[PDB]
Design an enzyme around this catalytic site. Structure first.
Site, PDB file in Angstrom:
ATOM      1  N   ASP A 102       0.825  -1.184   0.000  1.00  0.00           N
ATOM      2  CA  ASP A 102       0.000   0.000   0.000  1.00  0.00           C
ATOM      3  C   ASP A 102       0.875   1.256   0.000  1.00  0.00           C
ATOM      4  O   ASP A 102       0.967   1.956   1.037  1.00  0.00           O
ATOM      5  CB  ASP A 102      -0.820  -0.063   1.284  1.00  0.00           C
ATOM      6  CG  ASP A 102      -1.857   1.040   1.403  1.00  0.00           C
ATOM      7  OD1 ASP A 102      -2.096   1.815   0.444  1.00  0.00           O
ATOM      8  OD2 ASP A 102      -2.441   1.114   2.494  1.00  0.00           O
ATOM      9  N   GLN A 122      11.378   1.007 -25.924  1.00  0.00           N
ATOM     10  CA  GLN A 122      12.533   1.789 -26.387  1.00  0.00           C
ATOM     11  C   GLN A 122      12.478   2.165 -27.876  1.00  0.00           C
ATOM     12  O   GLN A 122      12.941   3.252 -28.248  1.00  0.00           O
ATOM     13  CB  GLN A 122      13.861   1.037 -26.135  1.00  0.00           C
ATOM     14  CG  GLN A 122      14.347   1.084 -24.691  1.00  0.00           C
ATOM     15  CD  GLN A 122      15.486   0.096 -24.404  1.00  0.00           C
ATOM     16  OE1 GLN A 122      16.123  -0.442 -25.327  1.00  0.00           O
ATOM     17  NE2 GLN A 122      15.737  -0.155 -23.109  1.00  0.00           N
ATOM     18  N   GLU A 141      -2.483  10.051  -1.432  1.00  0.00           N
ATOM     19  CA  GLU A 141      -3.659   9.246  -1.515  1.00  0.00           C
ATOM     20  C   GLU A 141      -4.292   9.071  -0.126  1.00  0.00           C
ATOM     21  O   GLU A 141      -5.534   9.064  -0.001  1.00  0.00           O
ATOM     22  CB  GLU A 141      -3.346   7.874  -2.100  1.00  0.00           C
ATOM     23  CG  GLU A 141      -4.593   7.006  -2.223  1.00  0.00           C
ATOM     24  CD  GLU A 141      -4.780   5.972  -1.095  1.00  0.00           C
ATOM     25  OE1 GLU A 141      -4.125   6.075  -0.053  1.00  0.00           O
ATOM     26  OE2 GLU A 141      -5.581   5.048  -1.281  1.00  0.00           O
ATOM     27  N   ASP A 189      -3.424  -1.108  -6.527  1.00  0.00           N
ATOM     28  CA  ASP A 189      -3.404  -0.836  -5.101  1.00  0.00           C
ATOM     29  C   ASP A 189      -3.528  -2.143  -4.334  1.00  0.00           C
ATOM     30  O   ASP A 189      -4.188  -3.068  -4.780  1.00  0.00           O
ATOM     31  CB  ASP A 189      -4.557   0.102  -4.736  1.00  0.00           C
ATOM     32  CG  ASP A 189      -4.318   0.868  -3.448  1.00  0.00           C
ATOM     33  OD1 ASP A 189      -3.327   0.592  -2.757  1.00  0.00           O
ATOM     34  OD2 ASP A 189      -5.118   1.775  -3.119  1.00  0.00           O
TER      35      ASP A 189
HETATM   36  C1  LIG Z   1     -10.150  -3.893   5.259  1.00  0.00           C
HETATM   37  O1  LIG Z   1     -11.036  -4.011   4.122  1.00  0.00           O
HETATM   38  C2  LIG Z   1     -11.669  -2.875   3.656  1.00  0.00           C
HETATM   39  C3  LIG Z   1     -11.597  -1.632   4.295  1.00  0.00           C
HETATM   40  C4  LIG Z   1     -12.284  -0.524   3.765  1.00  0.00           C
HETATM   41  C5  LIG Z   1     -13.016  -0.708   2.588  1.00  0.00           C
HETATM   42  N1  LIG Z   1     -13.712   0.326   1.951  1.00  0.00           N
HETATM   43  C6  LIG Z   1     -13.141   1.442   1.457  1.00  0.00           C
HETATM   44  S1  LIG Z   1     -14.189   2.537   0.646  1.00  0.00           S
HETATM   45  N2  LIG Z   1     -11.796   1.656   1.594  1.00  0.00           N
HETATM   46  C7  LIG Z   1     -10.992   2.807   1.141  1.00  0.00           C
HETATM   47  C8  LIG Z   1      -9.542   2.353   0.934  1.00  0.00           C
HETATM   48  C9  LIG Z   1      -8.591   3.503   0.602  1.00  0.00           C
HETATM   49  N3  LIG Z   1      -7.208   3.039   0.750  1.00  0.00           N
HETATM   50  C10 LIG Z   1      -6.586   2.195  -0.084  1.00  0.00           C
HETATM   51  C11 LIG Z   1      -5.325   1.977   0.387  1.00  0.00           C
HETATM   52  N4  LIG Z   1      -5.205   2.693   1.534  1.00  0.00           N
HETATM   53  C12 LIG Z   1      -6.372   3.331   1.749  1.00  0.00           C
HETATM   54  C13 LIG Z   1     -13.069  -1.955   1.960  1.00  0.00           C
HETATM   55  C14 LIG Z   1     -12.389  -3.031   2.510  1.00  0.00           C
HETATM   56  O2  LIG Z   1     -12.410  -4.287   1.979  1.00  0.00           O
HETATM   57  C15 LIG Z   1     -13.271  -4.547   0.867  1.00  0.00           C
HETATM   58 ZN   LIG Z   2      -3.675   2.666   2.706  1.00  0.00          ZN
END
Ligand SMILES: COc1ccc(NC(=S)NCCCn2ccnc2)cc1OC
Ligand SMILES: [Zn+2]
Ligand SMILES: *[C@@H]1O[C@H](CO)[C@@H](O[C@@H]2O[C@H](CO)[C@@H](O[C@@H]3O[C@H](CO[C@H]4O[C@H](CO)[C@@H](O)[C@H](O[C@H]5O[C@H](CO)[C@@H](O)[C@H](O)[C@@H]5O)[C@@H]4O)[C@@H](O)[C@H](O[C@H]4O[C@H](CO)[C@@H](O)[C@H](O)[C@@H]4O[C@H]4O[C@H](CO)[C@@H](O)[C@H](O)[C@@H]4O)[C@@H]3O)[C@H](O)[C@H]2NC(C)=O)[C@H](O)[C@H]1NC(C)=O
Length: 307
Positions: A102, A122, A141, A189
């Protein structure tokens, strides 16, 4: 076959090590990685531009953000854009956080993809003006206090606005916005963990997703992948995941969102480090992805319209 484009893990591993340091916007590490991305893109033969700006944010006040963009064929009519974020998340109680998945690994994959496809990029790829390749490293981000609409995706909001704005005159006013020349933003990501699952988040880019599914099946059948886990699912996603693509989606840019769901076990914990990465999953993703990018660019003739 699948064998046209081979691995370069020596390059991958060094690139990852160079990115994988604490890099909250404003830190020493962030500046080190910023400069490293610029050097790396230049050395891989990209035209490199920094979108640098100051903005006031929670906790820190005024910070200096810089999106790092590399382009090959800048005067092309249209662009495949590939993206990841290079900032790391601020945690009061975890200054050592490196966000391996991440998104150190996503960022290293982008540079490594340019490297392994170097023999194409290239020369032959330069001999055209229909399509170019953009590599976007978004800054900021991550939220500084808590993720919300405002406290998130700072660099992307800014790059999207910059690319969206027109110049004066008939020729400009009849010409497309720069942002409209992106055929698809492919955003990577949360890549690095064992046995990731990527499902299709948007109908309009579902055919691109299907291509990933197909390349995976082909490489598997040729014995070129490690293990037997399916990484690219022919399934729609659960709910949507907020990310750097939002400001682009809001200006009508099509998005292929290559974020693993479920998120890695280690997400936003001190364990998102090198020790918890799964190299066979990384190598499998890389092989599928480098071939996807190559095929997209090689098969391109007329503008791709998915809007
Ligand atoms: C732990 O699992 C989750 C947690 C949150 C969400 N929902 C949202 S909208 N997340 C925004 C992530 C933005 N981000 C990306 C990398 N660092 C930050 C979904 C998840 O699993 C489906
Ligand atoms: Zn993150
Ligand atoms: C990019 O970075 C990544 C991350 O750093 C690097 O990834 C690492 O790559 C190395 C080298 O390839 C990996 O280490 C190797 O792992 C092999 C597999 O080990 C595991 O599975 C086997 C079953 O197949 C088990 O036997 C093992 O269990 C034993 O070892 C572990 C690890 O210490 C112990 O904890 C256990 O208790 C066991 O003792 C593992 O579960 C493994 O085969 C290989 O072993 C070679 O080296 C060791 C000494 O280090 C020798 O004992 C052994 O002989 C092996 O040597 C090879 O060559 C000689 C000839 O000189 C021959 O005699 C042998 O036949 C053999 O071919 C080694 O341990 C590592 O796991 C991996 N790390 C991660 C996190 O993924 C990438 O390499 C790097 N890429 C680049 C390009 O730099």
């Amino acid at each position: 076959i699948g064998s046209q484009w081979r691995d370069d893990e020596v390059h991958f591993n060094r690139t990852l090590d160079s990115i994988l340091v604490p890099r909250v916007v404003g830190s020493r590490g962030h500046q080190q990685v910023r400069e490293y991305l610029v050097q790396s893109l230049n050395g891989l033969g990209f035209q490199t531009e920094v979108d640098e700006f100051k903005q006031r944010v929670p906790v820190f006040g005024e910070l200096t953000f810089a999106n790092v963009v590399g382009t090959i064929n800048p005067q092309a009519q249209n662009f495949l854009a590939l993206a990841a974020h290079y900032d790391s998340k601020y945690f009061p109680n975890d200054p050592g956080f490196v966000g391996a998945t991440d998104s150190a690994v996503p960022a290293a994959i982008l540079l490594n993809t340019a490297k392994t496809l170097g023999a194409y990029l290239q020369k032959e790829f330069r001999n055209r003006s229909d399509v170019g390749l953009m590599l976007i490293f978004f800054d900021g981000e991550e939220a500084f206090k808590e993720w919300t609409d405002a406290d998130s995706v700072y660099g992307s909001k800014h790059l999207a606005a910059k690319l969206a704005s027109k110049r004066s005159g008939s020729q400009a006013q009849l010409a497309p916005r720069n942002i409209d020349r992106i055929e698809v933003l492919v955003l990577l990501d949360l890549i690095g963990a064992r046995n990731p699952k990527f499902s299709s988040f948007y109908e309009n880019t579902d055919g691109l997703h299907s291509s990933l599914v197909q390349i995976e099946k082909s490489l598997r059948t040729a014995g070129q992948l490690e293990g037997n886990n399916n990484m690219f699912l022919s399934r729609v996603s659960g709910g949507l995941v907020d990310d750097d693509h939002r400001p682009f989606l809001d200006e009508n840019v099509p998005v292929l969102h290559l974020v693993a769901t479920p998120f890695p076990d280690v997400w936003h914990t001190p364990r998102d480090n090198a020790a918890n990465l799964h190299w066979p999953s990384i190598r499998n993703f890389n092989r599928v992805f480098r071939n996807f990018v190559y095929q997209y660019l090689k098969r391109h003739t007329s503008p791709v319209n998915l809007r």
